[PDB]
Amino acid sequence: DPDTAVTNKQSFSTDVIYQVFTDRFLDGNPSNNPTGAAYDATCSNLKLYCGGDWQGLINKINDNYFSDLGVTALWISQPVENIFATINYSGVTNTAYHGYWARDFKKTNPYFGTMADFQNLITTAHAKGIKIVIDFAPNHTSPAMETDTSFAENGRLYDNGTLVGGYTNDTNGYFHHNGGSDFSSLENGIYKNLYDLADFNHNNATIDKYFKDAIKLWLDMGVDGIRVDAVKHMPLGWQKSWMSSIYAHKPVFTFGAWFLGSAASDADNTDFANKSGMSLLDFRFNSAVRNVFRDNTSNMYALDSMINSTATDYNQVNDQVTFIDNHDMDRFKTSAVNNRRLEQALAFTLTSRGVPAIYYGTEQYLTGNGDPDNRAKMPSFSKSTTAFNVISKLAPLRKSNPAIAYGSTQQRWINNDVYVYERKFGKSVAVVAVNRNLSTSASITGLSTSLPTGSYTDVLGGVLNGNNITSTNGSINNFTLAAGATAVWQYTTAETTPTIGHVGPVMGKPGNVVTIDGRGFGSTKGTVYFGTTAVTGAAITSWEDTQIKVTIPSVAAGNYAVKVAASGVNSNAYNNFTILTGDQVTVRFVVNNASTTLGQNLYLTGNVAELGNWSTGSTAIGPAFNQVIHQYPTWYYDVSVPAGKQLEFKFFKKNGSTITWESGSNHTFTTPASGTATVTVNWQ
């Protein structure tokens, strides 16, 4: 199967995701519409239901709205059953139209459709070569008040009809009862309620099993990717464990939402993206893009800086999901923001690194500030807008040109208003030039690219006032980049040598199957390398010129680099591939009496790769928590660790560069075969 096909559940780099709020798109079947006060046929009261459902998505796939638009994947609202009650928030009536107020993760939301409608959606999508990604929120259920059970549905959870439990009288501790987060710290936001939403206590084995089971259900229905909600409000440890169970079953591209306010590096966010097993919605990319194109608060240098900075911080930048806007911010379009700028931001995104996502209605220049105003009904299906055009012309390049999907980025020319960058992968190159200035053109001189000698046409056919160029061994002849212009020139050729473009997923236990997408692998089954270990024959389940499916060998757990060797020729190395010890389980380490010095933090390390393998650096677990679940001088941390294994571990305090360990012997604990556990020790 080519890396490009719809069957590629492990990589979304050659795709273009279209994020759509199911209720606001198209009510294909009015027979499932809510009844009474929860419904608004006109769709003027954005807090109520408008009727949009799965049949609507099906319809638009069938009449090629999406196929002509160029999108190759749909990201939909959370498919599960949500609370039926209505909530009056200080005068205003609110409904679960957004899909975020889950009540039963094992059943579908009747308003969107049935199980059948859903399967029918998967089938129709795959038939047109469109992947399906689902929103999934395991952090909570619905809004609930501990004291008043008559508010909404008191956060009650169901296991395919069977009641598991509500927020009040939660004797079993299925939820956290530590008040509501004030967002003052990472820990405060993980173990307290996100507003009035009942927060799941994932340390509870029932809850742990429920979510692994529940996700298997949807994977088994053929979903191709998962968008995890509120990753910054759940423990990294649990999540990683959860992720390894997903990858051991049916690996699918998975990314989360860790909100950020600027393009500035955020340590925790970087750490999550590199250690959790999933990637993230790229908020740094978003900010920089808006500062430059929408708000005029930054110039091209800010944009280039972010490109570099992000590429440096994230292990696999090609896995971050990019966008110009979405449901958590103002629509890109304002009366004060002109069309050409929106169009430029699209073109920029479509050609830049990562996995691009377009919030529905962007092609129709939809406006709307704040929640719920930015989630208005799809206004029209005209295929005539300039923006609709750009998407259809640029999107396909993600599949046809590997420089775009897998390439690096090099700044070729820049100044306050002009930016010219180059995407390159093997012999395939792509050059994009943008002039955000709306009134004045720019004379470009001395531009060099890797474009071979020849004359190149603007891939956009001049619709954004682009021009053609002539290369003489990279040296492009002088030309003028018109006002508000943007052009794409590219060169594609067949790769002759093995060259890896993507590997998915990048975490697993021996025995799993990963996907290696690239070029020049040739059709002769060669050899795969995990560090020094050669993997050949039957262990390589599939081999093609552009994609290899291989099985993780039984080597020591750790960080590896992956190489493909085709016909004695070695390819480039894809770094930071994590090999786990085996199945995972989440364990909460607790240590008492660990008093510290001002600015001194407590960490944890032990005898397995998952605990750092006795390291005191970036591989050590921590810094531990000491406020919500357990107060200082007791510290705690939820860590993903190997199932049924005897572990040796010790805590250690670190301030500046001086390390102080626990004395005595190492602590030992044998982990359960599955589920979760708590182990409490005393600082030595």
Ligand X SMILES: OC[C@H]1O[C@@H]2O[C@H]3[C@H](O)[C@@H](O)[C@@H](O[C@H]4[C@H](O)[C@@H](O)[C@@H](O[C@H]5[C@H](O)[C@@H](O)[C@@H](O[C@H]6[C@H](O)[C@@H](O)[C@@H](O[C@H]7[C@H](O)[C@@H](O)[C@@H](O[C@H]8[C@H](O)[C@@H](O)[C@@H](O[C@H]1[C@H](O)[C@H]2O)O[C@@H]8CO)O[C@@H]7CO)O[C@@H]6CO)O[C@@H]5CO)O[C@@H]4CO)O[C@@H]3CO
What residue number has its CB nearest to Ca ion?
53
Binding site partner of 457, from Ca ion, ligand X, none, Cβ cut-off 5-8 A by kind? none
Q: Hey, how many other C-beta atoms are within 10 angstroms of the C-beta on 573?
A: 14
User: Of 5, 44, 88, 89, which one interacts with ligand X (CB under 6 A)?
Assistant: 89
3-state helix, strand, coil in the chain (%, to 5): 20, 30, 50
Instruction: Tell how many helices (H) and how many strands (E) occur in the chain.
Output: 13, 42
Q: Is 371 in the site for ligand X (CB under 6 A)?
A: yes
Stretch that binds ligand X, among 122-130, 226-234, 356-364, 577-585 (CB under 6 A): 226-234
Footprint on residues 243-272 left by ligand X (CB under 6 A): 257, 259
Q: Of 165, 110, 161, nearest to 141 (Cα)?
A: 165
177 counts as binding ligand X under rule CB under 6 A: no
Single residue of 3, 15, 23, 27 touching Ca ion by CB under 5 A:
27
- For ligand X, the binding residue among 19, 94, 201, 276 (CB under 6 A) is 94
Binding of ligand X by 469 (CB under 6 A)? no
Instruction: Spell out, one character per residue from 297 to 336, where the chain touches ligand X: x when CB under 6 A holds, - when not.
Output: ------------------------------xx--------
- Residue position matching structure tokens 């009727």: 51
Chosen from Ca ion, ligand X, none, partner binding at 51 (C-beta under 5 to 8 Å by type): Ca ion
Question: Which CB, 259 or 479, lies closer to ligand X?
Answer: 259
Could you count the other beta carbons within 10 Å of the beta carbon of residue 369?
11
x/- letters, 99..138, toward Ca ion (CB under 5 A): ----------------------------------------
Closer residue to Ca ion (CB): 233 or 290:
233
Which among ligand X, Ca ion, none contacts residue 106 (Cβ within 5 to 8 A by kind)?
none
In the complex, minimum distance from the CB of residue 397 to ligand X, in angstroms, rounded to a whole number: 30
Rounded Cα distance between 181 and 259, Å, is 16
Q: Is position 194 an interface residue for ligand X (rule: CB under 6 A)?
A: yes
Shortest Cβ distance from residue 265 to Ca ion (Å)?
A: 24
Please name the residue that has the structure tokens 């757990």: 557
Rounded CA-CA distance 415/374 in Å is 33
Q: Contact 387/363 with Cβ under 8 angstroms? A: yes
CB of 532 to ligand X, least distance (A): 42
Shortest CB 534 distance to Ca ion, Å: 44
Backbone dihedral angles phi then psi of residue 308, each to the nearest 5 degrees? -65, -55
Q: Tell me the closest approach of the beta carbon of residue 535 to ligand X, in angstroms.
A: 41
Single out the residue of 679, 295, 525 nearest to residue 303, CA to CA: 295
- Least Å from the CB of residue 224 to ligand X: 22
- Residue (99 or 505) nearer to ligand X, CB: 99
Give the residue, chosen from 197, 263, 487, 604, that forms a contact with ligand X under the rule CB under 6 A: 197
Is residue 183 near ligand X by the rule CB under 6 A?
Answer: yes
**Distance, CA of 287 to chain centre:** 16
Residue found under tokens 């419904």: 39
Write a three-state SS string for 524-573.
CCCEEEECCEEECHHHCCEECCCEEEEECCCCCCEEEEEEEEECCEECCC
Is residue 290 part of the contact set for ligand X (CB under 6 A)?
no
Closest approach of Cβ 110 to Ca ion, in Å? 10
Task: Count the Cβ atoms, other than its own, within 10 Å of residue 107.
Answer: 17
Degrees to nearest 5, angle at CA 429 with 424 and 431: 100
Torsion of CA 536, 9, 557, 656, to 10 degrees: 140
Q: What is d(CA 36, CA 265) in angstroms, rounded to the nearest whole number?
A: 47
CB 86, min distance to ligand X, A: 12
What is the nearest approach in angstroms of ligand X to the Cβ of residue 94?
Answer: 6
In the complex with ligand X, the residue whose CB is nearer, 195 or 439, is 195
The verdict on 199 binding Ca ion (CB under 5 A) reads: yes
Of 132 and 194, which has the nearer Cβ to ligand X? 194
Q: Which does 295 bind (CB under 5 to 8 A by kind): Ca ion, ligand X, none?
A: none
CA dihedral 394, 296, 484, 72 (to 10 degrees): 10
> Which single residue brings its beta carbon nearest to ligand X?
328
Residue 195 binds ligand X (CB under 6 A):
yes
The count of chain residues that interact with Ca ion, using the rule CB under 5 A, is: 8
Among 25, 100, 175, 242, binds ligand X (CB under 6 A): 100
Q: For the chain, first and last CA: distance in Å?
A: 56
Q: Which of 79, 143, 354, 484 binds ligand X (CB under 6 A)?
A: 143
Cα-based distances in Å from 196 to 89, 99, 178, 188: 11, 16, 12, 14
Whether the CB-CB separation of 508 and 244 falls below 8 Å is answered with yes
Phi, psi for residue 509 in degrees, rounded to 5: -105, 155
- In the complex with ligand X, the residue whose CB is nearer, 131 or 232, is 232
Residue 485: CB minimum distance to ligand X, A? 34
Longest dimension (CA), the chain: 76
Query: Which of ligand X, Ca ion, none interacts with 259 (beta carbon under 5 to 8 A by kind)?
Result: ligand X
Contact partner at residue 100 from ligand X, Ca ion, none, CB < 5 to 8 Å by partner kind: ligand X
Q: Is 222 helix (H, G, I), strand (E, B) or coil?
A: coil
Number of residues that bind ligand X (CB under 6 A): 18
Q: Does 233 sit near Ca ion (CB under 5 A)?
A: yes
Q: What is the DSSP string of 609-665?
A: GGGTSS-SSTTSB-PPB-SSSS-TTSEEEEEEEETT-EEEEEEEEESSS-EEE--SS
Spatial separation of the C-alpha atoms in residues 651 and 620, rounded to whole Å: 10
Site for Ca ion in 31-90 (CB under 5 A): 32-33, 51, 53
∠ at Cα 391 (387, 397), nearest 5°?
150
Residues that bind ligand X (CB under 6 A): 89, 94, 98, 100, 143, 183, 194-197, 229-230, 232, 257, 259, 327-328, 371
Residues that bind Ca ion (CB under 5 A): 27, 32-33, 51, 53, 139, 199, 233
